[PDB]
Structure formats: structure tokens, C-alpha cells
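Anyone? Bumping this.
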Amino acid sequence: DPLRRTGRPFGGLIRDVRRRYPHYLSDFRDALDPQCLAAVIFIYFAALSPAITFGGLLGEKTQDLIGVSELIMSTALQGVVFCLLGAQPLLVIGFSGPLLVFEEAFFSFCSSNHLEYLVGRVWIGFWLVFLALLMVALEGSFLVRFVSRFTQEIFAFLISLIFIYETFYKLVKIFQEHPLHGCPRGQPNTALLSLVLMAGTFFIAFFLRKFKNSRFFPGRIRRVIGDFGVPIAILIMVLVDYSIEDTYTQKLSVPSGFSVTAPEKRGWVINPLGEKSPFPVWMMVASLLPAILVFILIFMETQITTLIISKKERMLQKGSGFHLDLLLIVAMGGICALFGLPWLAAATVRSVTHANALTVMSKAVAPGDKPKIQEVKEQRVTGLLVALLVGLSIVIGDLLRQIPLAVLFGIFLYMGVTSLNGIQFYERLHLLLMPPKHHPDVTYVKKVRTLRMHLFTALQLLCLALLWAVMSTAASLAFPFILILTVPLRMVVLTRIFTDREMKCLDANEAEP
Amino acid sequence: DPLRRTGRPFGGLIRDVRRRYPHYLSDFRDALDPQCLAAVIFIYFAALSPAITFGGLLGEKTQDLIGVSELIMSTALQGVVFCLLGAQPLLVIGFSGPLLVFEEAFFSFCSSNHLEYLVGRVWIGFWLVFLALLMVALEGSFLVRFVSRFTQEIFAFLISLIFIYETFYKLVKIFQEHPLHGCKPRGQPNTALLSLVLMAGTFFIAFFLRKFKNSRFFPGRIRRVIGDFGVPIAILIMVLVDYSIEDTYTQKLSVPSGFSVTAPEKRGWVINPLGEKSPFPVWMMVASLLPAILVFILIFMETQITTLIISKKERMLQKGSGFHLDLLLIVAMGGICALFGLPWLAAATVRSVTHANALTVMSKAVAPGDKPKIQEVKEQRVTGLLVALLVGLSIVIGDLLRQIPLAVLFGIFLYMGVTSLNGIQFYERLHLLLMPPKHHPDVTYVKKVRTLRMHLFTALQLLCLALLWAVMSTAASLAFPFILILTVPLRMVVLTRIFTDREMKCLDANEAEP
Ligand SMILES: *[C@@H](S)Nc1ccc(CCc2ccc(NCS)cc2S(=O)(=O)O)c(S(=O)(=O)O)c1
Ligand SMILES: O=S(=O)(O)c1cc(NCS)ccc1CCc1ccc(NCS)cc1S(=O)(=O)O
């Protein structure tokens, strides 16, 4: 029982270290496998592109104080450190939306009150470090036991439906800028060529995915070719685009040189005191509240991601760490805030994709259903390699300018669609449309009436819709608290409506029950 | 045994009439089924488009002596009298490639020798009628019993593959006239890519609805009704999508206006058997027997092989087919329509197969293992008659038809070509080449035949198909029917020595589960 309160200071941290660190050389020996190369290549782009996008957005929102280079250099240096000293090396940490919202809100607050922004974030980082140390000392990561499977599949369907809505609203906007008229802002043949490239990439990678499980060719060649599906699709579509000469397509652009984005109003080291004018003393002690808010955000997303990754269905044997994963992340964020780099948190879709890009499926028997997961092939090399490649991507800035963005949209759609399977809420959504005589032989259909599982699904959908509506309004910083409020809902309100057997069968801690 | 020599004049024709005509009202009362409407709508376009294409080509190649108003009126009047009086009403008859090749060759010959073309074809038609009557009287259609499944699976494969090359060539050439440079019409932008988008959308919606028809979603009746109307739904959706766009130019379907000949200044509706302007030489009247023999061979091979493919034992056809009352009605409506200047017609293989398998009903299954089996076919005389009548009256309408782009129909044609491939064993044995020997299914011809002696059969069949294609693509392509005929002596002599009796019996067998 990893989530147990020992009753001694730093007990959980010591237990996690003793559990994980003995299996150290195994991680480096396990990496010798040609599936690791495919995983590295696939995850490199999925980690690089959000860095550029969110760096551009954050540079636009602020006065060009934090840009793209700083985000890349924070991502690389936190990823390397975490993969070297982390308990769970299958997690990919990076910038996300809620952090951007908090950053813009804090910038607005600082600008309104005539305060320093970069100097202001240093005290927030210090308070973050203090809170992390206090929580690890008096161990409180045992509260993750109360997060069930009702509050962790209302949050992984919303973080996968908010990433397929905006991977195709970044196409409905290359077709409003370059519109289809006749006789850059007005180029022809661009909006349709982008559609062609995106469709080609996502239909190729999902047929190589189907071909991986087919009966054609020898097994070893078939599996090797199926592993390299995304790289093959990317290379094919890049060559196809390169063949065309006159048509203009937007291409991936990275900054040049290792330097700050505002070399005339900023430096690499931020003074804790006033950089130009003295910092008010009252703000030093009043900076505790934003520290609490950002701590709550980071804690919820990292812990829920770790819970989703470490399910018993996915055959993970070495173990996960709920104590040596939050201290590291929060301490790194607090330290990076001193140099002006942004804070980082584990990414859910990227971590899930990285985890399920290394799974090995059982060699079946004609009867067998969806093959079962045999192993996961976990190691400390893929994440470290991805983080350094992202770090050194500035030096190779000429090879990356030959890759259009429209090709990567198909890969992003592939990621979003693939990450959906494996959660029971999607399956219960599927069961709504099928007639009651075609339902499968799972444990929550046989022991539960048909009209009382649809009610559970309807309530879960109502909660998800409320979460989305709250996120889309002018007060979106209360989203973590609304998500937290689902736990008392399950523990109080849903207990009265449903009987003990129905609740036990519907959301069980494990498979079968 | 329909293919048996009775020994009496017109015995086969009488037997076919007595077998088929009693079940006459059944055909008209079977048509009350919403799958028939979907079949009619699907086959209407598949019959209309080749008429326009081949009419344009033949008008180009014959100095506008036969156009697309003579191809839309031979296709519609010679197919309302094969479903009214035909033994097999699941056949769709229309113009094809070999007929076009023969027509251009005959036009060249007539132009070289200063002869009349339209007057020249009348005697060929008369000799065709005489040959058909002579062959039916002697009941010579029993020779179809010697065409196996080695010489009729080669044909199916070639025809579907040459219909999937021509759809791809139409696209390759919309991007050669309108190229991606950027700055009836030529050089327009956004056209070559929009055509690709429309074609891909139609094709993928067609397969999506085809797969949804067999899914477990929605009630069964609604699911099957929606799955039946897959092609019409895809066509309507893509037509609306194209109609939404305003400025981009796309080529659209065009039909002639009015019921009249294409050259009203050098042609009429009735061709005089004698000289139209100058007297016709007497020697040609008797020398026209050879082209009549050639066109008779072409029509006979096409129609009989199509009827053989349609009437397999696997597809649950119960009323019966006619090998005699379908070669006196096709080679004698043709023959006598050419005294009015209309072209000859023969049964179309892909269109007939599509029409046949668009009415099949698959069994309600149980659990995975084999693909559902055919339960029935739902054969009737109404769908073909309605399609022919609609093709005939497609001239008064056409303001509606000018709103339909060609790029949408290319996806439907590709769907037809891909779908028509399944059901023949040569494709399955081609699939078995790539799979390892431990994944072969439990069919009768894998269990009883060694692995390395079925690959040899497949290789020889591929060699024959490649030789057929090479001969078809050279400057002497009128010998293709004879090269196809030569496969029967090959199977009956050469392949007997190489393979043992058991291997030949299992490989090529008259019926599933030898
Ligand atoms: C491709 S990276 N384009 C994307 C733009 C934005 C996002 C994040 C969307 C988002 C989610 C949640 C919140 N508030 C939670 S308190 C705000 C936003 S915002 O629109 O950025 O402001 C993404 S992705 O979800 O990370 O894929 C992609
Ligand atoms: O094979 S098809 O009947 O689909 C066809 C389609 C098109 N374009 C879209 S309708 C164009 C031509 C054809 C017929 C191809 C063909 C097949 C055989 C022969 N010779 C046999 S002796 C000749 C042709 S041809 O039309 O290219 O001359």
C-alpha cells in the first residue's frame, strides 16, 4: 500500500526511494530495443510543438518578458533532472493552459498595482518550495486515496476533448486567413493543401496501426514496421510537401541562439529584492495566496496523471512514487522562478501517449479479444533523450524549418483519438446507442440494471458539462476547486441514490471487482 | 442442367421460356421493398456516366456521325426490351471499350476505301441477325460448359482492375490541365485540390456507411435502412458541400438538349439499306460477313461470361438464368437498331455485378468466424426497367444534372471497382501469397493442396493475365477475344500434365465445397 500514512516524518519519501532506487541499472539495460527509438522520435515532436505554441502565446500576453527560448530551456533542464532523479520516469512535464491563465492574471495584477512581475514571481516560488517541504515532511500525499475513478475519468475525457477541439480550430483558421476566392494573407492552394497533408498523415499512421495487427508478412518485420508508423507517415508527407514547388505552406520555426527574448529589459538572474526600484515588504508576505493556488493546480494535474498512468490494467511492476514526484517538481519550479523560467507540471495526454507507445501486446490465439497488455517496457532513457533533444533543438534550426505545421496536425489528431480508449466512461457512452441485447460481458453490465447505468453516465456527463462551462467563463481559475468538489459529491450525494452493490460494481478500484 | 443439348431445333429457347415465364407476376410484386429504390438511385448514375463519356469519344472518333444522343437512346430502348422480355433481368447492357475499338477500326477502313459508314453497318447488322438465328436454331450455346473458373476469374479481375485505372487517370489529368502554379477553362486555381477533396470525401463516407450497416448501433431496421442508402447519402452530402462553395470552378455533368441527331445536316433517323447518296457496291454486301463474325464473337464472350459470373451457386439465385433467351435478344436488337444508326450493345460486367450485389440480403449472424452468408438475392424486373427509363428521359431534365460535379462520381466509381473485387478466388489466392503459411484459412483448396503448388497455379494465372493485358495494350487489340478463348485449350491440355487430378479438382471446382 504505497498510499499509507506511516506516522513518521518523511516516511513516504524514504519508502519510495528504497522501493525504486535498487532497480537503477535495469532502466538503462532495458532501453536496448528498437521500439525505444520509435518512441523517442514520436514524442520529440509532441513535446517540441506545444513549447513553441505556448511560448509565442505567453510572449504575446506579457510584454515579451518570457518567450520561446526560456520555455524550451526550462522544459529541457526540468525534464533532464526529473528523468535522472525521478521515481516515475514515464511522465512528461511541460507548460499547459491553466498555468498560462494564471500567468496572464498575475501579469495583469502586477501591471495594475505598479509592481515588478519577474521579481514578484520569485517570492511565489519561495513559498511554493516552503509549502512542498511542509507537505512532504508532514506527509499528506495519502489524500490521493479519496480520488476514485469517477473523478479521474471526468478529468481525462475533458483534457482529451479540449485538445481535439483545438487541433481542429487551428485548421478552421488557415481557411479564414487564406480564404478560397481566385483571380502572407491571400495565397491560393494553401488551405486545401493543408487539409490534404493532414488527412494523409492521419490516414497513413492509423493503417500502419491496423497493419501492425494484421496477418501479413513475417511477425518480426510486421511488428518493426508497425512500431515506426508515425515516423514513416511524417517522412512520407514531408517528402510529398517538399516535392511541390510554388505553393506556400506555413512551416515550423524555432528561435536562433541561446539568449533571452528581451535582452534590453531583462537578464538571466533576477534579484530577489528590487531589480530597479525597491520591492514592497508587504507583497513578500502577501504572495502566499497565489503560491497556494499554483500549488493546488500543479498537485491536482500531477497526481491525477500519475493515478491514471499507474492503473493495474497497464502491467507496471517497478512501481510509482507519489512522494518523490511532487517535491521534485515543486522544488524545480521554485528554483527556476529565480532565473525567470516558467513553472512546469506533468502533461496528461503526452504522458499517456508515452506510456502506451511502449506497451507490448500478447501474441494471441484466433479466439482472443483485444489482446491483453503483456508488459510496458519502462526505462529512464527515452525521457532523458527527448528532453535533451528538445534542449538542443535550437542548434538544429534549419532541419526543422522544412516541416510544415499541417503535417503535425494529423499526428496530434492521432494522439487525441488514440488516448481515448482505456477509460470506462467512453465505453459507457458507447453503450448508450447500442440496443440492450448487444452489450458485452463486462462485470458492470451483468450485475447492474440497464436503466441505472445510463443514469450514472448521465450524471457524469452533467458534471463534465458543468466543468466545461465553468472553464469557458470569465472565472476559470476556480476549475481545480470545482474538480475537487466531485469527491464530496461521490462520498455523500451519490451514496443515497445508488445502493452499495451498484456503487461497488460501477466504479471499482480495479478490473473485475 | 440448363447447358444440355436436347437434340431438337430451338429446344433450349423453349426450355428457357417454359422455365422462366411462369414466374412473371412474382417479379413485379417482389419490387415493393425500400432497397429497390436505393438500387435504382445507385445504378442510375453508374449507367448514365459511361453513356456520356463513350458518346463523346465516339463522336470525336467518327466525325460526329454517332454522338451522345444516339448512345443515350440505344441504352434506353434496348434495355426496356430486355427487362420486359429477358430471361435474366439482373443484366445491365451498354457500350464498352472493345466495341469502340471495332467502331474506330471500321470507320478507318470505310474512309480508306471511299465507302459509306452508316450504310456499311446495316449489312453487318443483318449478318449478325442471321448468325444469331442460325446459332439459336442449332442450340450451339451449350459450348459454355467448357469455360471453367480459370477463364472466367481472369476476366473478372481484368475488368475491375481496368475500371480502377481509368478513375485514377481522370484525376491525374484534372491536375495536368489546372496545375498548382498560383497567381473548358484552363489554369484555374483551387480546382485540382477541391476535386481530390470531393472524391476522397465521397469514397470515405461510402465505406463508413457500408461498415455502419454491419455495426451494433441503433435499432436493426433503422440501421439497415440507413446502410442501404449509403451511396445516395454520400452523393447528396458532397453535392451540397460543393454547392456551398461559390467562387471555385469545378467541372459539372452535361447532357445534350433535345431529342435529335448530333449532325442534322449530314445524317437522318433512317438509313437506307442501299446507297444513301451513291450506290453501295454489291461485293461489300457479301464481304461484310467477317466483321459480323468478329463482333458476334465479342458480344457472345462478353455476355456469356457475365451471365456465368452472375449465376454462381454461391449467390442464392432460384428463379433461374437463360443462356439462350439472352443472345437472340442482345444480338438481334443490336443488329436491327443499326438501321436507324444506333450503336450495338452488350452486357456490362461491373455494372451487372454491382446491380446483382446491391440487392443481396445477408443472414442475421451469431458471433465472429465467417462473413455472414447470402440469404437471398431479391431478383425482379422493375429496377432495370426503371433505370433504363430514367436514362432515356434524362434529356428533358438536366438542369438538375448540371449541378453535379464529376469529381463526386469518381469516388462512387472507385467504390464500385473496389467492392466488385471480393467474391472471386483469384483475389483470395493473391492475398495468400503475402501471409505466412500458418495463417491460411480453413478453405477446401488449402487443406488438400500443398502450399508450393497453389502458388504455382496463382503464378501461371498471373502470367496469363499479364499476357492478356500486354496484348490488349499493343497495336493489335482486336485479337483479345481469341487470346481469351485460347485459355480453354490451355486448361484442357497443358495444365492437365503439370497437376494431378486431385489438385485440379480442388483448385478449379464448379462449386464451393468441392
Ligand atoms: C494547440 S497547442 N492549441 C492549444 C491552445 C490552447 C490549449 C489549452 C486550452 C485551455 C484549457 C484550459 C484552460 N483553463 C483551465 S483553468 C484554458 C485554455 S486556453 O484556451 O489556452 O487559454 C491547448 S491544449 O488543451 O493544451 O491542447 C492547445
Ligand atoms: O474499362 S472502362 O470501360 O471502365 C473505360 C473507362 C474509361 N474512362 C471512364 S468511362 C475509358 C476507357 C475505358 C475502356 C478501356 C479499354 C478496355 C479495353 C480495350 N480493348 C479491348 S479489345 C480498349 C479500351 S480504351 O477505351 O482505352 O480504348
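Late reply, but here is one note on the structure posted above: The radius of gyration of chain A is 24 Å.
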